[PDB]
Design a protein around this ligand. Structure first.
Ligand SMILES: [Zn+2]
Ligand SMILES: [Zn+2]
Ligand SMILES: [Zn+2]
Ligand SMILES: [Zn+2]
Ligand SMILES: [Zn+2]
Ligand SMILES: [Zn+2]
Ligand SMILES: [Zn+2]
Ligand SMILES: [Zn+2]
Length: 242
């Protein structure tokens, strides 16, 4: 296997979110691309990653292999990688993966593979809204500072998020707020979620300018981050009743 990706910052943002859900995870490296699924202990939130070969500068993987890793270990390896730089992965045997960070002058890490079994992995929505990622990020952070639950409601024109309780750090996403690019509307809906979980994965918002937010009354919220080249990271969060 030999892979070159043009921007280590995206892997960094993915690892920052994963370490909040799990201590270990598994990249399933196949000839057509890389996949990963991680679910937290309580089976309340999950992250799925799909990185097709088409999104990499170089991707030559004649044989599949599973790369198990400790999320905090990888976060610290990547810690000193602030600028957009290439990351090269070459693995000739199961046991170790060589990661080379380019630019910001050369760092090479030989990472030993560890055993990690993939979650025993098992979607209809009332509203699916494409909204400004930074706007959502701001909203999640502000609500988390003052509430424990984020309420979301949507109709044919907008999605509104606010914290549950007295006054409201309320934020509206719509064309008239210049933050909604598109919306698929089936039925007006309102749901509730633990904002602590959403704040944990806020780094995924660096992956794309827009995020597709999908939900239905008392059903999971789904956030989809579509990346350039066909990449997609999906975050799923179980609902509260209200
Ligand atoms: Zn090879
Ligand atoms: Zn190469
Ligand atoms: Zn090789
Ligand atoms: Zn109405
Ligand atoms: Zn109407
Ligand atoms: Zn909570
Ligand atoms: Zn947490
Ligand atoms: Zn509540």
């Amino acid at each position: 296997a030999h892979i070159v990706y043009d921007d280590v910052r995206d892997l960094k943002a993915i690892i920052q979110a994963l370490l909040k859900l799990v201590d270990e995870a598994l990249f399933d490296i196949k000839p057509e691309g890389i996949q990963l699924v991680a679910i937290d202990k309580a089976h309340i939130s999950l992250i799925k990653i799909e990185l097709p070969k088409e999104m990499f500068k170089e991707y030559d993987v004649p044989e599949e292999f599973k790369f198990g890793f400790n999320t905090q270990y990888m976060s610290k390896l990547l810690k000193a990688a602030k600028r957009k730089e290439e990351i090269i992965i070459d693995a000739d045997s199961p046991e170790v993966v060589k990661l080379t960070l380019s630019g910001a002058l050369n760092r090479v890490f030989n990472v030993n593979n560890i055993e990690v079994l993939p979650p025993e992995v098992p979607l209809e929505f009332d509203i699916k809204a494409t909204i400004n990622a930074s706007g959502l990020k701001n909203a999640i952070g502000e609500i988390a500072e003052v509430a424990d639950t984020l309420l979301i409601s949507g109709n044919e024109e907008k999605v509104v998020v606010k914290g549950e309780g007295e006054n409201k750090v309320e934020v509206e996403f719509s064309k008239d707020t210049g933050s909604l690019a598109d919306i698929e509307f089936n039925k007006e809906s309102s749901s509730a979620y633990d904002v602590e979980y959403l704040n944990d994965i806020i780094s995924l918002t660096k992956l794309s300018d827009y995020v597709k937010v999908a939900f239905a009354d008392q059903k999971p919220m789904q956030l989809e981050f579509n990346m350039e080249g066909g990449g997609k990271v999906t975050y799923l969060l179980a609902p509260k009743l209200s």
